[PDB]
Design a protein around this ligand. Structure first.
Ligand SMILES: *C(=O)c1ccc(-c2ccc(C(=O)OCC)cn2)nc1
Ligand SMILES: *NNC(=O)c1ccc(-c2ccc(C(N)=O)cn2)nc1
Ligand SMILES: Cc1ccccc1C
Ligand SMILES: Cc1ccccc1C
Ligand SMILES: Cc1ccccc1C
Length: 9
């Protein structure tokens, strides 16, 4: 989940 967001950065 975290990674899924973090791709933004
Ligand atoms: C949510 O973004 C997210 C993405 C990916 C993962 C995740 C957890 C574990 C692995 C892995 O290779 O584990 C080896 C034991 C890969 N990806 N978690 C949460
Ligand atoms: N928000 N994330 C990024 O902008 C980002 C782009 C690319 C990478 C990355 C990581 C690792 C490799 C590699 N060949 O191991 C390439 N690009 N991380 C973050
Ligand atoms: C489990 C989950 C839920 C919502 C967004 C992304 C991810 C990986
Ligand atoms: C696991 C990780 C760590 C730092 C930035 C992005 C991601 C996907
Ligand atoms: C395949 C994938 C998707 C989103 C963030 C990181 C990675 C390794």
């Amino acid at each position: 989940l975290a990674a899924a967001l973090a791709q933004a950065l």
